[PDB]
Amino acid sequence: RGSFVEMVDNLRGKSGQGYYVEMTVGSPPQTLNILVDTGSSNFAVGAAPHPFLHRYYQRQLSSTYRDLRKGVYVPYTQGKWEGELGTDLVSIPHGPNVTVRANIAAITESDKFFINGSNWEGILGLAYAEIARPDDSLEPFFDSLVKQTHVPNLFSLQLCGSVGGSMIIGGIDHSLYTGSLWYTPIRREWYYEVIIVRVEINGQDLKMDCKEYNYDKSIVDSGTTNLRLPKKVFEAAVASIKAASSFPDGFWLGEQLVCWQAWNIFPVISLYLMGEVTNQSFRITILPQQYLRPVDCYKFAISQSSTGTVMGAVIMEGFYVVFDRARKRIGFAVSACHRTAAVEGPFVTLDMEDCGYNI
Numbered sequence: 001r002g003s004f005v006e007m008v009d010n011l012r013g014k015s016g017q018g019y020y021v022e023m024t025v026g027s028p029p030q031t032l033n034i035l036v037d038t039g040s041s042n043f044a045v046g047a048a049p050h051p052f053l054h055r056y057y058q059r060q061l062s063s064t065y066r067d068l069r070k071g072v073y074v075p076y077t078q079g080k081w082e083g084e085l086g087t088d089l090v091s092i093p094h095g096p097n098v099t100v101r102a103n104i105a106a107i108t109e110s111d112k113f114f115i116n117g118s119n120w121e122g123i124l125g126l127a128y129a130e131i132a133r134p135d136d137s138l139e140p141f142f143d144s145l146v147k148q149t150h151v152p153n154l155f156s157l158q159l160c161g162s163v164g165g166s167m168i169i170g171g172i173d174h175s176l177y178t179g180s181l182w183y184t185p186i187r188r189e190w191y192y193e194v195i196i197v198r199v200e201i202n203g204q205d206l207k208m209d210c211k212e213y214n215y216d217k218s219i220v221d222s223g224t225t226n227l228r229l230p231k232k233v234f235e236a237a238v239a240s241i242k243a244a245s246s247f248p249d250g251f252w253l254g255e256q257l258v259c260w261q262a263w264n265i266f267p268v269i270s271l272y273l274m275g276e277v278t279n280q281s282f283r284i285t286i287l288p289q290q291y292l293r294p295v296d297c298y299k300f301a302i303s304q305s306s307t308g309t310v311m312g313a314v315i316m317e318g319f320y321v322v323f324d325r326a327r328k329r330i331g332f333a334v335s336a337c338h339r340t341a342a343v344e345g346p347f348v349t350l351d352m353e354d355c356g357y358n359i
């Protein structure tokens with residue numbers, strides 16, 4: 001229950017290109033490297049010899065593949081992916097010793113989806129059915145896993161910033177963190193939505209209506225690199241970090257990098273998250289090591305958003321993060337692989353419910 005040595009160090013990546021896990025699809029098993037994404041809900045894999053791909057799902061070679069005779073189209077601002085739906089047998093070699101029949105989108109056409117020079121060929125959407133495409137009737141991978149096996153309904157991520165990490169499927173590994181886990185409620189089961197109730201720069205409150213910290217929504221998303229903040233909050237955050245570190249104007253907007261010869265002028269950032277108890281919150285503290293990401297040239301790893309707050313790899317790399325789906329909560333503890341990053345509580349915060357934005 002608290003030890004999963006087989007699953008420790010099962011993630012790899014390249015800086016800025018996400019974290020991936022080895023998976024097998026079909027019979028006989030086809031090995032594929034798959035992007036771990038808590039911000040989406042489709043299991044989708046390259047199914048055609050796109051030039052950027054080391055390998056791809058060859059449906060014709062699999063005796064257990066079943067055609068669902070249905071297309072799926074996922075548009076982005078940039079480009080897109082498009083594919084054909086089916087089911088097949090799926091395993092995770094460095095995961096639980098089980099095999100499940102899962103939905104798979106065989107990607108037949110894409111634009112700006114596969115990265116030139118990356119070592120992954122698909123995406124594993126770990127979020128809920130509600131945001132699955134084409135609709136919520138397409139059961140996500142993790143739902144299928146839980147429905148078909150005795151694997152407990154939770155997973156955890158230790159993202160260590162080329163890069164490596166651990167995805168513990170069905171449990172928690174206590175050697176992957178120090179101190180205690182602190183839990184924040186999943187507000188709704190679509191994205192991993194949470195509520196930020198207070199933001200501090202260097203220990204100083206931003207003094208904003210907390211509703212705006214979640215304007216639209218706040219999510220935990222392993223497929224995003226940056227800490228993304230709502231426009232107005234980003235505005236205030238930058239203005240406060242700027243004043244704490246008194247650099248070009250375009251650097252703050254992510255329009256150009258800044259280079260130095262091969263930290264203390266930059267403040268710590270505390271996010272207070274809604275706790276499990278009425279009027280109780282806790283805080284996570286991230287270092288400038290987290291929001292200043294090397295590409296010695298660094299890209300300011302905080303950016304504005306029109307889709308709400310996104311707690312991406314920047315945040316997650318400082319912490320062991322538990323996606324406790326059974327109890328509708330997300331746990332945070334100091335990573336045993338990350339001034340140090342901190343998770344602290346309890347704090348008294350009133351009117352935390354008001355911080356959630358409603359349609």
Ligand SMILES: C[C@@H](N)Cc1ccc(O)cc1
Binds near residue numbers: 112
């Ligand atoms: C992480 C996904 N939800 C979004 C995404 C997909 C492909 C890519 O190259 C970059 C980002």
